[PDB]
């Protein structure tokens, strides 16, 4: 209950923490936290705002030690990807990690899918799938006022 309450508090505060992050600090598994989560919402007759791609960019980019411009580009890419519906049904964490990977690979500070996956809590396959969906539209997702260390046309294709 305490672990699930901590997740709800983070959501209410506008600083969502993924279930994998809350699980990583608690002896309770993601599954049990997820079960208690919905039960508490019913018990409290309350609800929490839907998570968004921008809620994790600050934490993930800082944990990855990415420059400010890379974090801004990743935020824009993820936001535009959701608006363009390029990632239907994809979890926002997977989209954020994929957007971070794209922006990182386009910048001087290049991070691998494993490094981003370990910090974001997403499998490299899930990142790769989410990245493969957004890669064709990469020039539209990147900001117009962004400085490219590696041009969008040379971004990794897979």
């Amino acid at each position: 209950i305490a672990s699930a309450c901590l997740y709800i508090a983070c959501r209410q505060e506008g600083v969502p923490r993924t279930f994998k992050e809350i699980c990583a600090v608690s002896r309770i598994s993601k599954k049990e936290i997820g079960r208690c989560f919905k039960l508490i919402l019913k018990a409290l007759e309350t609800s929490v705002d839907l998570i968004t791609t921008g809620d994790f960019m600050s934490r993930f980019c800082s944990n990855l030690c990415l420059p400010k411009q890379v974090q801004m580009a990743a935020t824009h890419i993820a936001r535009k990807a959701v608006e363009l519906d390029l990632v239907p049904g994809r979890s926002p964490i997977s989209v954020a990690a994929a957007a971070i990977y794209m922006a990182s690979q386009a910048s001087a500070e290049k991070r691998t899918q494993k490094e981003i996956g370990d910090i974001a809590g997403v499998a490299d396959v899930t990142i790769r799938q989410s990245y493969r969906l957004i890669y064709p539209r990469a020039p539209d997702l990147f900001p117009t006022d962004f400085k490219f260390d590696t041009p969008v046309d040379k971004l990794p294709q897979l």
Partner: protein, 222 residues
């Protein structure tokens, strides 16, 4: 005749030996070149009213060590050994004591500094870290110990309910080993559900307060 008997030939023949104190680096080189048998030469010079001892290290091993003698009259020292064949013996009595020192002094302090620096290498000091550690509490779906414990629990499965006759046979088999047992131990011994076990046990056995550390059941049916 006993294992502890000492061969006192060293004392009987009055074998005299010299106890010499030498630096660790010097004896380390002798141990390294031990297979050569040419670690150096020991020179002793005596005069009308003065005597000196010194050692010269082999050039190849080095690539004069004056010795200062010390009195042996203030305390009686003897040398003894234990053979690998479990036979003790006394080699002799210390008739002279000396200590090795270097001839030079200024350059010798350089060697001591080098030895100190080498001896300082194992002294671990707190390291300053330029970037915060971001790998702690990395996001995980379920802990390693939990999936392992869950797998063992699910693979082994829950404890089944044996037939009443087999449960009674196990209970009486346990009674042959001991008169009374703690319920927790009895559950592990009989390998039955605590509820199911208690139902069968209460029909014959009983629980009574005893001086043992935990509440124990009495298996005698009467």
């Amino acid at each position: 005749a006993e294992r502890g008997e000492l061969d006192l030939t060293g004392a009987k023949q009055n074998t005299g030996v010299w106890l010499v104190k030498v630096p660790k680096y010097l004896s380390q080189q002798w141990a390294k070149a031990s297979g050569r048998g040419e670690v150096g030469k020991l020179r002793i010079a005596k005069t009308q009213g003065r005597t000196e001892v010194s050692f010269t290290l082999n050039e190849d091993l080095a690539n004069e060590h004056p010795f200062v003698l010390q009195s042996v009259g203030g305390q009686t020292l003897t040398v003894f050994t234990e053979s690998s064949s479990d036979k003790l013996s006394l080699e002799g009595i210390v008739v002279q004591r000396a200590e090795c020192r270097p001839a030079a002094s200024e350059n010798y302090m350089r060697l001591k500094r080098l030895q100190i620096e080498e001896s300082s290498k194992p002294v671990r000091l707190s390291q300053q870290l330029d970037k915060v550690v971001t790998t702690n509490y990395k996001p995980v779906a379920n802990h390693q110990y939990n999936i392992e414990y869950e797998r063992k629990k699910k693979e082994d499965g829950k404890r089944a309910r044996a037939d009443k006759q087999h449960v009674l046979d196990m209970l009486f088999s346990a009674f042959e080993k001991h008169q009374y047992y703690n319920l927790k131990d009895l559950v592990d011994i009989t390998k039955q559900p605590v509820v199911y076990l208690k139902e069968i046990l209460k029909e014959i056995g009983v629980q009574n307060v005893k001086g043992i550390h935990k509440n124990t059941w009495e298996l005698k049916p009467e």
